PDB file of C-alpha atoms in Angstrom:
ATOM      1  CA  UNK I   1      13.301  15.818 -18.819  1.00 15.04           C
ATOM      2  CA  UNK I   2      12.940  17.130 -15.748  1.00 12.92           C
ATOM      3  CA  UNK I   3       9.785  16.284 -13.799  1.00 12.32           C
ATOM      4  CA  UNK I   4       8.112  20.022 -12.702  1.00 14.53           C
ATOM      5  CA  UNK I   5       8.437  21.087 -16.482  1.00 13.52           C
ATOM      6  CA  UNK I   6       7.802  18.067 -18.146  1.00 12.98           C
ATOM      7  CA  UNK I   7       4.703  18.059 -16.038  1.00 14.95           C
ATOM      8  CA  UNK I   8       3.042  21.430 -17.506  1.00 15.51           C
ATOM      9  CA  UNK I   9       4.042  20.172 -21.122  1.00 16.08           C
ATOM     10  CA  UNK I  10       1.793  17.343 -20.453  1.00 15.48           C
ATOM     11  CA  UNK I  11      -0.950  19.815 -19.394  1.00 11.89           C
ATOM     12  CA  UNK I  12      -0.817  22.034 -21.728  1.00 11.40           C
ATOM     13  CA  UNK I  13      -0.691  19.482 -24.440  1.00 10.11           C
ATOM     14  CA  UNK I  14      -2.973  17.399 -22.616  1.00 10.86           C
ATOM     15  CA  UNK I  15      -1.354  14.090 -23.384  1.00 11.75           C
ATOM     16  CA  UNK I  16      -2.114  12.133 -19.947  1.00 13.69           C
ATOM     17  CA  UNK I  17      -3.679   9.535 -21.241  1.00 11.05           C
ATOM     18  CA  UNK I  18      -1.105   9.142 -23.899  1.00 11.72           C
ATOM     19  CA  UNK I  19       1.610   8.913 -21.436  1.00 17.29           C
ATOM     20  CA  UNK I  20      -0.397   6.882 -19.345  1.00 20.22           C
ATOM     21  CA  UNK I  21      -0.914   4.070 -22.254  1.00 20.15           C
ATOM     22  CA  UNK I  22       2.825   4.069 -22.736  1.00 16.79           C
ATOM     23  CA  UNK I  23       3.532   2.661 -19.534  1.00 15.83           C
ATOM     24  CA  UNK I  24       0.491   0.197 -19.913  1.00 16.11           C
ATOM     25  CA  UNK I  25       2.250  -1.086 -22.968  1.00 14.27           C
ATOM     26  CA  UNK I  26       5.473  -1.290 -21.551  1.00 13.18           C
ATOM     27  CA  UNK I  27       4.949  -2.990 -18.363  1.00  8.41           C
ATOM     28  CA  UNK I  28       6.234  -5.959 -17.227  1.00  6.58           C
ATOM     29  CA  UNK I  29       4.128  -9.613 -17.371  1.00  7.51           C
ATOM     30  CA  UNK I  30       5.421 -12.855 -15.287  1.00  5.13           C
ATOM     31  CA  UNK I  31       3.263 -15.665 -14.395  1.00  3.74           C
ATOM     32  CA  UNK I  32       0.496 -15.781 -11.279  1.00  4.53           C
ATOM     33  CA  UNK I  33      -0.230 -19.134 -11.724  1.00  4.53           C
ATOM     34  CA  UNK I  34      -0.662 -19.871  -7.752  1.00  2.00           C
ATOM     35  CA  UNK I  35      -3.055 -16.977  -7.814  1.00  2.00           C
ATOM     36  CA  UNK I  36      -5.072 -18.823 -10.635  1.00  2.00           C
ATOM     37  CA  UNK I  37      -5.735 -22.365  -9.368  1.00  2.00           C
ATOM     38  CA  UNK I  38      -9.083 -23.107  -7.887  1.00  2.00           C
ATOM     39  CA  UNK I  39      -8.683 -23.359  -4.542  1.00  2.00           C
ATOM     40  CA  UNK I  40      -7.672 -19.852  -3.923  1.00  2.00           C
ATOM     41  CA  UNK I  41     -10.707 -18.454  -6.216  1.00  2.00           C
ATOM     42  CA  UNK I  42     -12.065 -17.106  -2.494  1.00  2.00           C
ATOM     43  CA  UNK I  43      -8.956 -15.214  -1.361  1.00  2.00           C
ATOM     44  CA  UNK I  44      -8.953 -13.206  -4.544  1.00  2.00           C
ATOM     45  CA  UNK I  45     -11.403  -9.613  -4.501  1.00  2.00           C
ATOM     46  CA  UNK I  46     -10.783  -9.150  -8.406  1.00  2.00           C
ATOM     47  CA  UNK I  47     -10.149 -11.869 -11.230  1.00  2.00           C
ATOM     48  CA  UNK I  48      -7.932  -9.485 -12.617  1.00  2.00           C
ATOM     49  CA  UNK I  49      -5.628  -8.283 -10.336  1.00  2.00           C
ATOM     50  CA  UNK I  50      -3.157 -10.869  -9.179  1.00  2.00           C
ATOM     51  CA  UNK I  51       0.697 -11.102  -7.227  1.00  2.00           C
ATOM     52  CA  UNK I  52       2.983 -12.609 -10.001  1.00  2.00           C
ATOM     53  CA  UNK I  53       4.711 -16.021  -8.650  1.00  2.00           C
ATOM     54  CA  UNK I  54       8.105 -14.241  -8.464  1.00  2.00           C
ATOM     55  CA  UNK I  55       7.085 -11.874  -5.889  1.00  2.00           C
ATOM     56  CA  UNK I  56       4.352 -13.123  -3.898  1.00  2.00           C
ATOM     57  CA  UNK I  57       4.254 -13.276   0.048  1.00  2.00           C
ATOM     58  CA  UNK I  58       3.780 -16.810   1.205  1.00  2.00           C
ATOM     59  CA  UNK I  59       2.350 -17.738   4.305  1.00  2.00           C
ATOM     60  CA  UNK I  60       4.334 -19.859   6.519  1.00  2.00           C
ATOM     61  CA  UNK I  61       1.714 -22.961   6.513  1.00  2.00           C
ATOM     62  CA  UNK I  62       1.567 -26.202   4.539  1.00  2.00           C
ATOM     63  CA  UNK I  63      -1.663 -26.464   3.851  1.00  2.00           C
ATOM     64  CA  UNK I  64      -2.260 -23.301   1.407  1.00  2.00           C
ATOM     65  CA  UNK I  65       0.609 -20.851   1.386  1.00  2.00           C
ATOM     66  CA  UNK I  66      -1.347 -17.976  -0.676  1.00  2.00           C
ATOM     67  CA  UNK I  67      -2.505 -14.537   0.270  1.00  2.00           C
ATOM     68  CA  UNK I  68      -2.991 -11.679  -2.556  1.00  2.00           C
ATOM     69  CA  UNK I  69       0.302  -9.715  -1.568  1.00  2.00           C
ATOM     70  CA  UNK I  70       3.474  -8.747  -3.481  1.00  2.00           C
ATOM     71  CA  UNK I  71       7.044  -7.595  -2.219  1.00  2.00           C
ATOM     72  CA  UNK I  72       8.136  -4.819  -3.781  1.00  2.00           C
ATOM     73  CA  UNK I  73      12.020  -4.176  -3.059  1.00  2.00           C
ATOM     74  CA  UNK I  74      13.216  -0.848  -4.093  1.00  2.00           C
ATOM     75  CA  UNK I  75      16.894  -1.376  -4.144  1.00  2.00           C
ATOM     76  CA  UNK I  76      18.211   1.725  -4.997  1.00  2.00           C
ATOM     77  CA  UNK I  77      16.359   3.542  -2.771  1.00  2.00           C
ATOM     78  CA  UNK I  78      16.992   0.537  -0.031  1.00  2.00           C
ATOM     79  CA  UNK I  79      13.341   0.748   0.662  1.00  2.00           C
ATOM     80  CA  UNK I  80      10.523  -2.273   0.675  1.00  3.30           C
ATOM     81  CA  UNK I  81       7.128  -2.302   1.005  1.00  2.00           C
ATOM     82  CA  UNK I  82       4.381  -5.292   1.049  1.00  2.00           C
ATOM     83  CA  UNK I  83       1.266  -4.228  -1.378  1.00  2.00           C
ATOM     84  CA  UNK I  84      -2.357  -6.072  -0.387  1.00  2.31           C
ATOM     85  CA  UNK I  85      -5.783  -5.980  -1.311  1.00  2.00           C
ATOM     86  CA  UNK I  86      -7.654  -5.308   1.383  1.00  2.00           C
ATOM     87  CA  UNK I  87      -9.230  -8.294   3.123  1.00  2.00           C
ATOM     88  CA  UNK I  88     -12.494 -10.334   2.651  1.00  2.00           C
ATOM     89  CA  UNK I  89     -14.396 -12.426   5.085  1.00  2.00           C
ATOM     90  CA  UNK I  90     -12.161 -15.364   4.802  1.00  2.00           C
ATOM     91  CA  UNK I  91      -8.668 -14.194   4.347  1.00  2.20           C
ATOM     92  CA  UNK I  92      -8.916 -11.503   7.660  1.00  4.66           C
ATOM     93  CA  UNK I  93      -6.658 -14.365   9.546  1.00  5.16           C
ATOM     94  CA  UNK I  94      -4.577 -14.426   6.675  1.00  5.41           C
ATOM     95  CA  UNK I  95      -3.544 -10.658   6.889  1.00  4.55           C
ATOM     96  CA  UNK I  96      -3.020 -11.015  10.034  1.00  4.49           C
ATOM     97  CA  UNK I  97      -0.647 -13.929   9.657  1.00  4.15           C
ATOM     98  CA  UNK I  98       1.419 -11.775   6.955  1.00  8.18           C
ATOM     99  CA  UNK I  99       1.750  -8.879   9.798  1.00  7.37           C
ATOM    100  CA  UNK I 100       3.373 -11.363  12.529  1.00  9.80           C
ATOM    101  CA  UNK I 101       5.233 -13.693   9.888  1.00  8.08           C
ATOM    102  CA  UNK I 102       6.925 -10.402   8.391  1.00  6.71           C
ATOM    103  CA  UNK I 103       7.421  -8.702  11.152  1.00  8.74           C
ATOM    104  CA  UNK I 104       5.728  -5.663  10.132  1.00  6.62           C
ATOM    105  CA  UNK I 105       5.156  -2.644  12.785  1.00  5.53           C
ATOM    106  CA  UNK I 106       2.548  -0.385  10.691  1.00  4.48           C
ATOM    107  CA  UNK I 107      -0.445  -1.207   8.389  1.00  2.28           C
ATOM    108  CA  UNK I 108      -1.407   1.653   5.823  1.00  2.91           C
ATOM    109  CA  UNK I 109      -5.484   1.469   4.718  1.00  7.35           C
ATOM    110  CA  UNK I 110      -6.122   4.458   1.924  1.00  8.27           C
ATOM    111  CA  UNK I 111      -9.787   3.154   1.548  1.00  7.70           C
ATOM    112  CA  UNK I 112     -13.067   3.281   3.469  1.00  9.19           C
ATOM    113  CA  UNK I 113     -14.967  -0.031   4.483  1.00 14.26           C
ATOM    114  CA  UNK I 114     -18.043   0.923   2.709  1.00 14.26           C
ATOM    115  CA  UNK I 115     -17.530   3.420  -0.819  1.00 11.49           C
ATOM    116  CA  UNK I 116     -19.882   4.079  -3.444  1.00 12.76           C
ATOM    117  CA  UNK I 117     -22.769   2.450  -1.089  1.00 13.40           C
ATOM    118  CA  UNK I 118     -20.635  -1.264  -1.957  1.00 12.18           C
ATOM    119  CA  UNK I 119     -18.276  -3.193   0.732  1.00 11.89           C
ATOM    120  CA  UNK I 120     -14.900  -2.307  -0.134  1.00 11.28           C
ATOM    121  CA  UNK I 121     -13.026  -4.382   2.543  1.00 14.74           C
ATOM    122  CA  UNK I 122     -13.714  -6.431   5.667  1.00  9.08           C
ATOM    123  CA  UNK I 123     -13.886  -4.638   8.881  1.00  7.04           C
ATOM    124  CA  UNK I 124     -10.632  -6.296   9.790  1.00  5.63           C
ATOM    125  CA  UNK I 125      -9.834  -4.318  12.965  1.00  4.53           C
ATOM    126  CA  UNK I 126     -11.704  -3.749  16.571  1.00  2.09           C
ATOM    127  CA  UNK I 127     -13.434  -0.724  17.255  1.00  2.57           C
ATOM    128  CA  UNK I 128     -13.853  -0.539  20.621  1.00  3.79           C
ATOM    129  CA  UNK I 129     -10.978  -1.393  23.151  1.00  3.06           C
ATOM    130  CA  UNK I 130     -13.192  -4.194  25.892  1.00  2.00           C
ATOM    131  CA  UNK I 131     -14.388  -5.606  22.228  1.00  2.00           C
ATOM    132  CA  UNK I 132     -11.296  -7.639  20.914  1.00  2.00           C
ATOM    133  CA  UNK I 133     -10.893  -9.855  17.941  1.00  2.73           C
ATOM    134  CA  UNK I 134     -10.167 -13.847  17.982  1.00  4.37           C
ATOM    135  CA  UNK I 135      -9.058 -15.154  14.819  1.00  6.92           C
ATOM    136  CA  UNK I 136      -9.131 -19.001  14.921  1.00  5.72           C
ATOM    137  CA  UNK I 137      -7.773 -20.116  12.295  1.00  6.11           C
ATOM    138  CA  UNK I 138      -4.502 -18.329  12.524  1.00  4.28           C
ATOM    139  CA  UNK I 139      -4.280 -18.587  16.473  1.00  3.03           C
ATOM    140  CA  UNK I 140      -4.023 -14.949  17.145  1.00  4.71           C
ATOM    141  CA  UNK I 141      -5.814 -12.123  19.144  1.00  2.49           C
ATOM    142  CA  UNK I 142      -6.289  -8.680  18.201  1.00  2.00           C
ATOM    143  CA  UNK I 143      -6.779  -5.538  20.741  1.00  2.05           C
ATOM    144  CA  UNK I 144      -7.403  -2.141  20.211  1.00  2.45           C
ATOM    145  CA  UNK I 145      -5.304  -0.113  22.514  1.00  3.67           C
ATOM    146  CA  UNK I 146      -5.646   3.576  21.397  1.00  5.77           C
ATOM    147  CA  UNK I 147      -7.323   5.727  18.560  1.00  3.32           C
ATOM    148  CA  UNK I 148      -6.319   9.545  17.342  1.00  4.42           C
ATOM    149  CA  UNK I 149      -8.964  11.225  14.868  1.00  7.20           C
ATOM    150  CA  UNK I 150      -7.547  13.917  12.798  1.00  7.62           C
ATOM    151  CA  UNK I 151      -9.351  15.527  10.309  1.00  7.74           C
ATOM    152  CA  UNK I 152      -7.783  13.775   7.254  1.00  7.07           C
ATOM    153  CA  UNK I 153      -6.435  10.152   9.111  1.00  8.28           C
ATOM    154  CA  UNK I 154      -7.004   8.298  11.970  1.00  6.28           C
ATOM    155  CA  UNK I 155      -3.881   6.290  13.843  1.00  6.62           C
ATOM    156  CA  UNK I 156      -4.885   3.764  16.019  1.00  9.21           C
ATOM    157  CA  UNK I 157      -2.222   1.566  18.202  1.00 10.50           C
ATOM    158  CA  UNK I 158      -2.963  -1.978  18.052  1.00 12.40           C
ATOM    159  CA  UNK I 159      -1.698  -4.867  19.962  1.00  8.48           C
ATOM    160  CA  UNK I 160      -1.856  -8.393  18.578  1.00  6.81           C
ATOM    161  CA  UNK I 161      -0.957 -11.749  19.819  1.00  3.00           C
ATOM    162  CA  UNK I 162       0.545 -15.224  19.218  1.00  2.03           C
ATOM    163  CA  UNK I 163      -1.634 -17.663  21.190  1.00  2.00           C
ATOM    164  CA  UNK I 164       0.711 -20.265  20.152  1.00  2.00           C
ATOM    165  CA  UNK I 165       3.482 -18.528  21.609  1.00  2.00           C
ATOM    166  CA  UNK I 166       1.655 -15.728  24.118  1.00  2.00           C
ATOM    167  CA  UNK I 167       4.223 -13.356  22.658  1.00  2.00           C
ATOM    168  CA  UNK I 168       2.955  -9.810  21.687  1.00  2.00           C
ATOM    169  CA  UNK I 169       3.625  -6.697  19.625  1.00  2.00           C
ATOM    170  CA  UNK I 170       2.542  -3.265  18.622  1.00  2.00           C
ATOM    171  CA  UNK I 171       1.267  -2.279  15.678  1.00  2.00           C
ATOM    172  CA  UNK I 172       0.686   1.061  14.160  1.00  2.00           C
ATOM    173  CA  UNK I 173      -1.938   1.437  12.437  1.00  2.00           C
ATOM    174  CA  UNK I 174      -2.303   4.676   9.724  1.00  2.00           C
ATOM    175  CA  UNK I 175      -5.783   5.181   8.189  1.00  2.00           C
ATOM    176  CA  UNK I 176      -6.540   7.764   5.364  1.00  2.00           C
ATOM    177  CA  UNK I 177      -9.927   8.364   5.887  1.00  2.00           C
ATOM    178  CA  UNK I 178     -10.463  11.717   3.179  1.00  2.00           C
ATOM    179  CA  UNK I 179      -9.753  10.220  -0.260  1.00  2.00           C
ATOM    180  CA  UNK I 180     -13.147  11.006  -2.681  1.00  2.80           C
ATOM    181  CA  UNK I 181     -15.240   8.113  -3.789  1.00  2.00           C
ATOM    182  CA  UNK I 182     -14.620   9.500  -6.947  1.00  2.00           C
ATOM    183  CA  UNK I 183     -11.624  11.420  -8.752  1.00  2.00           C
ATOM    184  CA  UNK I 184      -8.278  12.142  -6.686  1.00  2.00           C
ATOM    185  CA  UNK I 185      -7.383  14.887  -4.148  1.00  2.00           C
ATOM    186  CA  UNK I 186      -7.256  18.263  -5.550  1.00  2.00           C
ATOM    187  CA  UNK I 187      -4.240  19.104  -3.939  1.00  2.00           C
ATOM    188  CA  UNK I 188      -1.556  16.356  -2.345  1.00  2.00           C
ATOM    189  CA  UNK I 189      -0.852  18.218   0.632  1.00  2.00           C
ATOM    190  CA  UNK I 190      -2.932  15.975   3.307  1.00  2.00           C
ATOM    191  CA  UNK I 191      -1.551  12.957   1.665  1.00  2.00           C
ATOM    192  CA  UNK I 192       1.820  13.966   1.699  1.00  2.00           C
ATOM    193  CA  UNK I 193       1.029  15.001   5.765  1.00  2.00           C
ATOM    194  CA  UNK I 194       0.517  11.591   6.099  1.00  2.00           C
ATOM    195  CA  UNK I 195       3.354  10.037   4.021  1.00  2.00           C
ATOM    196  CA  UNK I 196       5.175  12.040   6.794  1.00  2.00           C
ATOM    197  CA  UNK I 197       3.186  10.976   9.447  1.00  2.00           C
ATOM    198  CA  UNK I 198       3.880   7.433   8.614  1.00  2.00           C
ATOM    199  CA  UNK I 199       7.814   8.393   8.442  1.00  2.00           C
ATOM    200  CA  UNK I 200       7.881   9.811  11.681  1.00  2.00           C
ATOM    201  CA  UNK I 201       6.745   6.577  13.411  1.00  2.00           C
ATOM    202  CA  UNK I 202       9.509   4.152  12.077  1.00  2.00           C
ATOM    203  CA  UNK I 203       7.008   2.044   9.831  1.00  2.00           C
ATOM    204  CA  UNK I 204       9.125   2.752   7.146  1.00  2.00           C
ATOM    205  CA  UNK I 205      12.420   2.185   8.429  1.00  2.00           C
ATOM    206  CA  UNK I 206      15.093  -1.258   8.172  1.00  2.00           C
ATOM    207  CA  UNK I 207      15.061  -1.836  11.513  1.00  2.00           C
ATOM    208  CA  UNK I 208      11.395  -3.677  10.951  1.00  2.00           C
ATOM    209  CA  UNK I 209       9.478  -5.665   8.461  1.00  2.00           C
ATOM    210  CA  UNK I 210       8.536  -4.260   5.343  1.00  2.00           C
ATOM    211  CA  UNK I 211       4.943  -2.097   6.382  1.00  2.00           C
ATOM    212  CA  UNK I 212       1.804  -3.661   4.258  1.00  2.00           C
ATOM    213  CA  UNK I 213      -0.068  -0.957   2.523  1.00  2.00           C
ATOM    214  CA  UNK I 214      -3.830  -1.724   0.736  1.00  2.00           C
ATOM    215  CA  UNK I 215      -6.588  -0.532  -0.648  1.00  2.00           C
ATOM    216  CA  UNK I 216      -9.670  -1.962  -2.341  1.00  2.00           C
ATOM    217  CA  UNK I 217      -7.058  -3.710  -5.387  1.00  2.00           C
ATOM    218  CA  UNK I 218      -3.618  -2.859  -3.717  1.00  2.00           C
ATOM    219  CA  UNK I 219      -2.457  -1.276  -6.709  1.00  2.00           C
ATOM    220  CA  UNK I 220      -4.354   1.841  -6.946  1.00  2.00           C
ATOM    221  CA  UNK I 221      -4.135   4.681  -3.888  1.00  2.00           C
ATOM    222  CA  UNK I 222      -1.346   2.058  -2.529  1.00  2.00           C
ATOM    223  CA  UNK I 223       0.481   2.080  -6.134  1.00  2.00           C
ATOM    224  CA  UNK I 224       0.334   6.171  -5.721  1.00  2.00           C
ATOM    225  CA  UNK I 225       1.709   5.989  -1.876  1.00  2.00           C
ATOM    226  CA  UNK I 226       4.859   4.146  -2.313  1.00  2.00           C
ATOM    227  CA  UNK I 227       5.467   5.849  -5.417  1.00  2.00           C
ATOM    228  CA  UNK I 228       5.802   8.783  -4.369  1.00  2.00           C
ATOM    229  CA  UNK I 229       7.590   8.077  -0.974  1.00  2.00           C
ATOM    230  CA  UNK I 230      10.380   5.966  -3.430  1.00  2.00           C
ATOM    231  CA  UNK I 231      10.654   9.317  -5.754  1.00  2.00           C
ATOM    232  CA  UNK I 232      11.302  11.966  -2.745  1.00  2.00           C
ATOM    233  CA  UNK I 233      13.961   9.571  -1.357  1.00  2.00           C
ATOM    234  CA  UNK I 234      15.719   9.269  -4.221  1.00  2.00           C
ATOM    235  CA  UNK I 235      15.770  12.582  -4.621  1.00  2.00           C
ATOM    236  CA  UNK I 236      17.415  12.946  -1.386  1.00  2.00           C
ATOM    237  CA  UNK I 237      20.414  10.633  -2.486  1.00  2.00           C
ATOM    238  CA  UNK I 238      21.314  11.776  -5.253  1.00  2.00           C
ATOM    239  CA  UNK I 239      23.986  14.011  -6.332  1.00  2.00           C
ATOM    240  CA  UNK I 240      21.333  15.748  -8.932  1.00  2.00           C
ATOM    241  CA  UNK I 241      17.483  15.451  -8.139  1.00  2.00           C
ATOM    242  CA  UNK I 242      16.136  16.303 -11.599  1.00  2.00           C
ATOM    243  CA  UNK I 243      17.396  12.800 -12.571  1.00  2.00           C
ATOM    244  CA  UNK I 244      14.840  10.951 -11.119  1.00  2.00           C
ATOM    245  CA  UNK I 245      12.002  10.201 -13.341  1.00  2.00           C
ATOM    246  CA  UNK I 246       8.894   8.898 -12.077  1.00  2.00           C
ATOM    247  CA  UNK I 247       8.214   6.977 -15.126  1.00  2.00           C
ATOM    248  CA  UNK I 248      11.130   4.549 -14.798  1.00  2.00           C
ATOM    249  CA  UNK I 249      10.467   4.040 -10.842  1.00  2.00           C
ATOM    250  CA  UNK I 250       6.866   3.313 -11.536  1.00  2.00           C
ATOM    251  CA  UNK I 251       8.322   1.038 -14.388  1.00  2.00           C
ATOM    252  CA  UNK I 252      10.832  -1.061 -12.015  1.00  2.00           C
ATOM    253  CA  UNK I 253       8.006  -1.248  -9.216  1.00  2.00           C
ATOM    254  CA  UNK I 254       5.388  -2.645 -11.639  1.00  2.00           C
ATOM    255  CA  UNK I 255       8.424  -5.504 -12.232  1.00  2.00           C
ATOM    256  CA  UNK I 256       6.506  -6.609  -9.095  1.00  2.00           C
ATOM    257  CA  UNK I 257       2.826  -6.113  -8.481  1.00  2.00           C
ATOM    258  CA  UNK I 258       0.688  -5.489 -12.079  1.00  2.00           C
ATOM    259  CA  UNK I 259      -1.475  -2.550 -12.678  1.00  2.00           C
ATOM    260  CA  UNK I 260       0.336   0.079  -9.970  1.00  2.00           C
ATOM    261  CA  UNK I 261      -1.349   3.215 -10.845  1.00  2.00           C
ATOM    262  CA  UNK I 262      -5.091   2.527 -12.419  1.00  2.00           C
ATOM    263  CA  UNK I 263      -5.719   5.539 -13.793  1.00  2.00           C
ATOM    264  CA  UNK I 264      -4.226   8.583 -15.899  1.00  2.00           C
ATOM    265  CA  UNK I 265      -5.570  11.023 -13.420  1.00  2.00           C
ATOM    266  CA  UNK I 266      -3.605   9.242 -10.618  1.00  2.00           C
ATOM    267  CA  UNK I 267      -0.625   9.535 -12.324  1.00  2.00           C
ATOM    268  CA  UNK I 268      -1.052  12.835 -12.628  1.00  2.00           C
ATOM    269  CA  UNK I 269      -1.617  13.233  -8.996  1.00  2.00           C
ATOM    270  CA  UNK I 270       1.588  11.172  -8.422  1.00  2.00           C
ATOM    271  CA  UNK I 271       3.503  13.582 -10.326  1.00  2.00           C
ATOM    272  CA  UNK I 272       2.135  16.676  -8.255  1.00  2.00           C
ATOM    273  CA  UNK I 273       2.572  14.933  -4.861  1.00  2.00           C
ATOM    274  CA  UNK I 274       6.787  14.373  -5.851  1.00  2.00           C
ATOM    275  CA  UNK I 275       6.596  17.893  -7.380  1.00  2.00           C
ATOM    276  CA  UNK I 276       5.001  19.977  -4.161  1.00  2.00           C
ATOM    277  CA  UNK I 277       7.105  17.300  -1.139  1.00  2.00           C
ATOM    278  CA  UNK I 278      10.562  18.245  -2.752  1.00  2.00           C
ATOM    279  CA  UNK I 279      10.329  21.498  -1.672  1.00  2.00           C
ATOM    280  CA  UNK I 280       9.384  20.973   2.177  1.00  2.00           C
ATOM    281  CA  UNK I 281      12.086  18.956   2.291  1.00  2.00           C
ATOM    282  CA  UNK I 282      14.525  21.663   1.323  1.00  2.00           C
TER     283      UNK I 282
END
């Protein structure tokens, strides 16, 4: 069906959950057995959310090569994106690692540092510009260069560098700072602002690494994000937009992180977000 009519049968029959269970069922499962061995008990935030072995980002060192991260290649849409959760205490050199080793340019955060009065990730980034960061483990040096509050998201421009090497680069990063503790958005249109926002600065594009997005999990508000920025594009390319159905996208991207999407209510959200950007576009 198409997706702006097949969405109102769903409300009106009120089957969200229903759908929602389907995809549960039909979801892929691989092996995460890295994730699982002992030694990496304190670089995972949740027992239950894991990268499978196929698709996980390794770290280029010898001694423990494991960070919670996934590659997700889109290959129709010839977009990727790297899905994290966000960092703890101990893996904050990690992340940082990933950016350089990947060659990212932006960093996406949809979360808070502190929600529901709890600790939802590290503070992983400085705050005040003579106030940099050191992280000794990975050899690398973090400065804040620039911040923009907007009412929704902050973007802050970041530079970080190799110690090893002295080179530097710039990083973008994007910070949605208006999701509710509870619920979703009542209506996508900051998000999608964002998405665009994001767009605009070449985060997204081939001619860099693929740009890490995270949460709390990394499968939640970061499941709905690329999601929805895989839909609209393929709705650019093809000859007939009402082919694309959200369903089987969020199908073939769970074939590489578990659990994208966490709730029925963000998939509903997904839906409207795809539904209300096709039109802007034209």
């Amino acid at each position: 069906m198409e997706m702006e009519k097949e969405f109102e049968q769903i409300d009106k029959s009120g089957s969200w959950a229903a759908i929602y269970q389907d995809i549960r069922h039909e979801a892929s499962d691989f092996p995460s057995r890295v994730a699982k061995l002992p030694k990496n008990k304190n670089r995972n935030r949740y027992r239950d959310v894991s990268p499978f072995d196929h698709s996980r980002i390794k770290l280029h060192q010898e001694d423990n090569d494991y960070i919670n991260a996934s590659l997700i290649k889109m290959e129709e849409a010839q977009r990727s994106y790297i899905l994290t959760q966000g960092p703890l205490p101990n893996t904050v050199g990690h992340f940082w690692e990933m950016v350089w080793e990947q060659k990212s340019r932006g960093v996406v955060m949809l979360n808070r540092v502190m929600e529901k009065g709890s600790l939802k990730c590290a503070q992983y980034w400085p705050q005040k510009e003579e106030k940099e960061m050191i992280f000794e483990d990975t050899n690398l040096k973090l400065t804040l260069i620039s911040e923009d509050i907007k009412s929704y998201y902050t973007v802050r421009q970041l530079e970080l560098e190799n110690l090893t090497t002295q080179e530097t680069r710039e990083i973008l990063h994007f910070h949605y700072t208006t999701w509710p503790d509870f619920g979703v958005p009542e209506s996508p249109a900051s998000f999608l602002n964002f998405l665009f926002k994001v767009r605009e600065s070449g985060s997204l594009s081939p001619e860099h690494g693929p740009v890490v997005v995270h949460c709390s999990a990394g499968i939640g508000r970061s499941g709905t994000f690329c999601l929805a920025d895989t839909c609209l594009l393929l709705m650019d390319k093809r000859k007939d937009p009402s082919s694309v159905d959200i369903k089987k996208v969020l199908l073939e991207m769970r074939k590489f992180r578990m659990g994208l999407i966490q709730t029925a209510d963000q998939l509903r959200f997904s839906y409207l977000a795809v539904i209300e950007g096709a039109k802007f576009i034209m």
